[PDB]
Amino acid sequence: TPITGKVTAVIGAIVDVHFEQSELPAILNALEIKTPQGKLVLEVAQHLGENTVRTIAMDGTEGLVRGEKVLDTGGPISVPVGRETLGRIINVIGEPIDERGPIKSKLRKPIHADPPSFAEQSTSAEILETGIKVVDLLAPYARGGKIGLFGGAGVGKTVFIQELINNIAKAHGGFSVFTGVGERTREGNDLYREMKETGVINLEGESKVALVFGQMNEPPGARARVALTGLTIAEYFRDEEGQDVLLFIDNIFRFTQAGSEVSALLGRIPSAVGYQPTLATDMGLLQERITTTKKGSVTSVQAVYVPADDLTDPAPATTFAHLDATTVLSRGISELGIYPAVDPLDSKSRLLDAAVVGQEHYDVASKVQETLQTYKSLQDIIAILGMDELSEQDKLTVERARKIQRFLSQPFAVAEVFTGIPGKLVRLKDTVASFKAVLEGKYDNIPEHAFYMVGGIEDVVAKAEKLAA
Amino acid sequence: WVRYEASLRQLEQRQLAKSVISRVQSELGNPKFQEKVLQQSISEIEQLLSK
Amino acid sequence: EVSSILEERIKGVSDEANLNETGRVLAVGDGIARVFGLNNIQAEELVEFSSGVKGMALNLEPGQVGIVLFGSDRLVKEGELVKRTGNIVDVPVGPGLLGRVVDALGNPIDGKGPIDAAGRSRAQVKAPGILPRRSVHEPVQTGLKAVDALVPIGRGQRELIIGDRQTGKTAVALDTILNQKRWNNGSDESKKLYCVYVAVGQKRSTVAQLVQTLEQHDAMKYSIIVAATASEAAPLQYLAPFTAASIGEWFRDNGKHALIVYDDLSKQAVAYRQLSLLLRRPPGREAYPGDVFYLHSRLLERAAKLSEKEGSGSLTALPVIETQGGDVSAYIPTNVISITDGQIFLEAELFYKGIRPAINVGLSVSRVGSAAQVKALKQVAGSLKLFLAQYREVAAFAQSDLDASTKQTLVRGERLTQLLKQNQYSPLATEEQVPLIYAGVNGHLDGIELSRIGEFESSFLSYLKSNHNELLTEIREKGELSKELLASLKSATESFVAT
Amino acid sequence: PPPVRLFGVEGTYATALYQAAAKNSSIDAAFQSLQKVESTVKKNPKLGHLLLNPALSLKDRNSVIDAIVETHKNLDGYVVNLLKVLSENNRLGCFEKIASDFGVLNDAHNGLLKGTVTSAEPLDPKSFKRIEKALSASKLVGQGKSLKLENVVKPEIKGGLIVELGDKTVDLSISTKIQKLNKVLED
């Protein structure tokens, strides 16, 4: 029977219901309030006792007449999943917002689910290669990996992600999930158009990507469960279809942010900065449901816009905890004109282990790191004085490092327009070779400008010829 | 010429505004102040019966 | 006359109806009132108090409702009767708001009497979905070189304008409105932006100067000004951008192109901070509440270039951010940057150091701006950003000896920078910007001595018109520089160089 | 559920009292006895009104309770427990508050409606009666729900009247009409 209630309170999008009936829904149950907007979906999050629950409202709030009929839909919101989720952009509710009509589904699955157990997990060791030189050198990705970004704005976040979609998702043939959490509608429209164009969404046929999109205009509460919906879609592929997937999640700072917004309203004492006291728990569930298990290997990409550019803030701090590899993206390096904007002293990967990428790769990387760290160390001295007041030995090192820095900029294909340079994807084997030579100063004898914003070592040589003219 | 013409209309309106205030003070003196309560009373009787 | 209008108005007072009204004010002050009753009340209603002021119900609580007073607390007092308007906050929207200054209650502060407005529409309205959204194609032309070239600006986009206070902050935007006088006084409605200037938190005197300037350039007739001055109450200021955007959406939802400049959203942040604190909701970073992101993001994404289904309407947002010290990592600026497409960071140091207008080319980006550009302004402006980011590099390391390659770049670069500059409050025509950029790019301004650059510009334009305004008419209509035009222009420009 | 959600003003106490005694169907009885003890409390003024002032012990307060039920035997027994409860919860200032709340709750149960007809100065009894009749005739007064219309004197309402009941009001006063007129003739 529908559990009838009245809306006792409407404090923001944290509506509180008082179920008149002695029946009381459990926590994480779902409720429908009939509205002239069709329905309003609310989700029980606390029971405040005396047959008065307190519910997060997952759809927009306004117009509500305080005291109005509720019916209990029960349990977590159950999305509809299937292989026919491919070729659909779905709302948090599950509505086909791309309006390709009803999503055929066999199983409708609860948004909330319990993270797979320690035992069930299978831990990969596969290398995934992007063809982005800087990624390859500094932080080799892994297939099934959890990849992480520390966002530029969209100016950096979208661009980085677009390159990844271009590379990885054409190097993947399995299922792929795009989950866009609190992102601008335009980015989605561009992506949707682009995906359709590159047939990744084939409409005549079927896609190979599925998309979940949550706009940044969406109410905070709605934004909170956009992620979980995606997490379920991923689970269906991971488990039920039992094939390797791919996943993109951006912007998961918004997930954190959304949580911080609702927490205060919920009544929770807000922890430092402002972040929710439940920051750790929420992060834990999210990041343990993307795990590579024996059921399936899901390469995941998570993108956190650095709050006010402070990495020390608790939200980035808890992000660092659940990343197989990280690639912090920094405004300074963007200002240096290096695209990608990756800090080269702030990238790490678990597969940066020497054996894993072979001693030669590791030795090359070691030398790059040492050289650049020296160069950063002498950034003070160079600036306070000149670079001609450097010790001669160091001055050579510095000149080499200046070249290395310029070398790191590679034009990117899906941003070829934006850069204004036709893109480049350079082989990993080539990358190791290229840096090795540079470290031995083989090609150090030709302009720093030649190294700048061009691809491989061969390209540098050719651009020296261009410059020579 | 058009601008000052509009200004004169505004000046006339504020002059007639202070005359409205003067008329209000006069109205509230009268035991029309008393007698019109009866008018409101019967009007409310008609009104609320029309509800 | 005045008697007849007043008499018509007096006649228009006629009887009060019974209905659910009346709450009684209790604890009041701190700009929120706690009212007893109002048992059935729609959420986010407008209530009008019998203190003759209106407020928006915020907190619907068991047994009490907490109105937020949209207006002065001075007249509100305990045990006053609060009457339900019965309606969610809506503001009149229509066509007749054009060329009318109004305040945030839509009261004509131009005082041209009652505004003609087709409808009223709810203050908060969700942004259109993915499906209604067509990628930008039409440009917005500001008439200022580099602000169209180096910074390519196109319709629908939320194109940020960030910079430091009172660097003639307003002027960049005013110039845009002025350049588009030409097109907006056009007959093609596809070439009609209806531009809305939202003035928030500015001195009423300053706004009056702005109004007077706009009426001096006779620009009032295609533009609306909404005003929520610094004196005007903070809850009114909070609702001020949202209301303006509703009006903008009526034009947009006529499928007609429009633009809205939100001056200054940073002051909305301070207002929302004030409001939040007075609602004693916990403060966020820099004491700006945690829903500040939600506030800006919900506002900003209502500005869009819709699809053909929606009649391809635009509502190009230009939001004006006031950075405290050029604090580009500051919470409010960064939050805005992440929402917005591009940045138009204005270089304050250069502004002071005689570059008017001063655009920090490095800190100016436009995410999808460049495909709004017309082909003439893609071809002519081809790689000029790179060249002047070679000038940026060149002058970086200029600070001893200069190789002839470097020197050549420096000589061009310095001179090109001079060319960018414009006289504040006097923008150039779009047509005119094409040759000027042509000249420098095609290296005609390489030789021109630095002292005569200003002369070169005026004389070059006069020359072009006198010699053959035919070329300019062609580039005006074609909007693409043909090979013949390119050669003809090379020849013509060289001809001007000679003189 | 109990008619009208009061609560908070120790009206959770009133609610509790009501529902507990409602199934004992001795709410009228309770209300009457509560009125009687409340009345003899008000009519005990020398440190029985001024010893409603809290400063007593738990035990001493309890001995005040024992004196209160010594004062009469004619209590619901649920309200004898209510006296204990207030002593235990260490309030006695919200005793007439609870009494008033229970009265409101009770007369909601009775279905007696309450109105008000604020005026500038008290008006004719013929007018009072005409309004009472009119309101009772009108749909505003519910069927079998009996209005207790109170004319109140409020000088602040300049002339006219405001009729109030069932959170539906008509304020056709002189002050309000003048207000509206002024505004409309300032435009």
Structure overview:
The PDB classes it as hydrolase. The structure is cut from a larger assembly and holds chains A (469 residues), B (51 residues), C (499 residues) and D (187 residues). Chain A is of the alpha/beta class. Chain A is built from 16 helices and 18 strands. In chain A, a hairpin with a 2-residue loop joins strand 1 and strand 2 (14-19). In chain A, helix 10 packs across helix 12 (392-407) and helix 10 crosses helix 14 (428-439). With 51 residues, chain B is mainly α. The radius of gyration of chain B is 19 Å and the shape is elongated. Chain C has 499 residues and is an alpha/beta fold. Chain C starts with a helix and ends with a helix. Chain D has helices spanning 11-22, 27-42, 58-70, 79-89, 96-110, 125-137, 174-184, and strands spanning 116-119, 151-153, 161-165, 168-172. In chain D, helix 1 crosses helix 5 (96-110). Chain D is an alpha+beta fold and 187 residues long. In chain D, a hairpin with a 2-residue loop joins strand 3 and strand 4. The chains are: A alpha/beta (469), B mainly alpha (51), C alpha/beta (499), D alpha+beta (187). Strand 1 (19-20) of chain C pairs antiparallel with strand 4 of chain D, so a sheet runs across the interface.
* Largest interface: chains, residues each: A-C, 53 and 58 residues
Q: What does the overall shape of chain C look like?
A: elongated
CATH C-level class of the largest domain in chain C is Alpha Beta
Q: How much helix, percentage-wise, in residues of chain C?
A: 25-40%
Strand content of chain C: 15-25%
> Number of helix segments of chain B?
2
Strand order of the largest sheet of chain C: 2-3-6-5-4-7
Coarse structural class of chain B: mainly alpha
Report the biggest beta sheet of chain B as strand number plus sense, adding barrel if it closes: none
Order of helices and strands of chain B: HH
Distance between the termini of chain B: 54 Å
Quaternary form: part of a larger assembly
Count of discrete alpha- or pi-helical segments spanning 4 or more residues of chain C: 16
Per DSSP E runs of 2 or more residues, the count of β-strands of chain C stands at 17
Shape of chain B: elongated
Main location (chain D): mitochondrion
Organism (chain D): Saccharomyces cerevisiae (strain ATCC 204508 / S288c)
GO cellular component, one term (chain D): mitochondrion
Family (chain D): Belongs to the ATPase delta chain family.
